[PDB]
């Protein structure tokens, strides 16, 4: 668990140790489910998944969460609104209902998620405080 001087908090994990292995026949193919890492040894494919649990209190009580997706402007190239087609913004979808939150990371939008306090505003940017 890493704390940094810009106010950021980070979780670094390092996986090491030894591969779970199962026996492999002399003429048996580790097939597509595993790899022959040593004669007669089959290391099966697997995923290591973690569930980070966060109970937030972002700048106080009363919080919300949202998905943040990067998007090109809806207006096309050559339009008065996006003449050179470089316009882009961040689409904030704040979850209203549990169902709304069930989301996945999307590379297509460089998705991030915000946990914020809708009861407060940043005096400069006008956005609520958030992590």
């Amino acid at each position: 668990w890493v704390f940094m001087q810009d106010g950021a908090i980070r979780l670094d994990i390092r996986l090491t140790g030894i591969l779970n292995t199962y026996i492999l026949g002399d003429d048996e193919e580790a097939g597509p489910w595993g790899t022959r890492v040593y004669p007669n040894v089959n290391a099966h494919n697997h995923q290591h998944l973690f569930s980070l649990r966060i109970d937030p209190r972002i700048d106080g009580d009363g919080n919300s969460a949202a998905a943040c997706d990067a998007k090109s402007s809806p207006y096309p190239l050559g339009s008065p609104e996006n003449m050179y087609g470089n316009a882009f913004y961040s689409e904030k979808t704040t979850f209203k209902t549990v169902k709304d939150s069930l989301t996945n990371y999307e590379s297509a939008t460089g998705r991030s998620w915000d946990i914020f306090n809708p009861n407060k505003v940043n005096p400069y940017s006008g956005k609520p405080p958030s992590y």
């Binding site: 190239l77 050559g78 008065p80 609104e81 003449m83 050179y84």
Partner: protein, 131 residues
């Protein structure tokens, strides 16, 4: 009523030099609100304009939301032909025709040229007279 049929689609791709410098050519019809001096659809000074910028038709169209119903309007119609040359066209080409028409429909309450002296006219009774 505009009865026009030689309305070729613009073959140059969107975003092309052609399509950008001739914003009016992408549609057979463009109708915009009237404003004094809205004469040239590709801008007042056409040579060497790249096609980037809100001027001409692109400017008059704007966000396409202005009213054109029951007001002073301007109707720009794109028509023409697509020429795939043949030896018959060389060294001097025979005239190729293009036409369009604007007919009065519901303007008059009956054929307006009925009072033009006919070239010939025999009534049914007159036909009997002649025996």
């Amino acid at each position: 009523k505009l009865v026009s049929t030689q309305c070729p689609p613009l073959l140059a791709k969107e975003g092309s030099l052609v399509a950008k410098r001739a914003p009016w050519a992408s549609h057979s019809v463009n109708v915009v609100p009237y404003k004094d001096n809205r004469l040239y659809p590709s801008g007042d000074h056409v040579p060497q304009w790249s096609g980037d910028g809100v001027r001409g038709m692109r400017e008059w169209i704007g966000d396409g939301s202005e009213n054109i119903d029951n007001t002073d309007i301007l109707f720009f119609h794109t028509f023409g032909i697509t020429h795939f040359p043949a030896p018959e066209d060389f060294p001097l080409m025979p005239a190729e025709p293009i036409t369009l028409m604007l007919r009065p429909r519901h303007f008059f309450t009956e054929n307006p040229g009925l009072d033009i002296q006919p070239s010939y006219a025999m009534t049914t009774s007159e036909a009997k007279r002649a025996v």
